[PDB]
Amino acid sequence: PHYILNTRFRKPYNVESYTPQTQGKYEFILKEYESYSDFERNVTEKMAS
Amino acid sequence: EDSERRPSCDIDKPPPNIELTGNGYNELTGQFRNRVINTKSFGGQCRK
Known part of the structure; x- marks a missing residue:
């Protein structure tokens, strides 16, 4: 008799162990990059007579 | 035999x-590494 949760199971003769070994990972990343630029250049020239 | x-x-x-x-x-x-000790040799016992 083998159990996982409350379910019961039969093990094939070929298999040494089937067991839950119940492990979990979560890996998360979030990334942001931002870049901004603004350039303004002007000229003014005048004459009168 | 069931008897x-x-x-x-x-x-x-x-x-x-x-x-x-x-x-x-x-x-x-x-x-961890594979099954070494028999974890379930009940041994005809009802240790509950």
Whole structure:
């Protein structure tokens, strides 16, 4: 008799162990990059007579 | 024979992963390794 949760199971003769070994990972990343630029250049020239 | 058979205990269920207690252990990789101790030799006993 083998159990996982409350379910019961039969093990094939070929298999040494089937067991839950119940492990979990979560890996998360979030990334942001931002870049901004603004350039303004002007000229003014005048004459009168 | 079903006439010779008798109950060994009221239940068949172990603690839910008793299996992992009988595994081997590789110190240098850090990991568990396959089934070394028989975790479930009930031994005709009803230790509950």
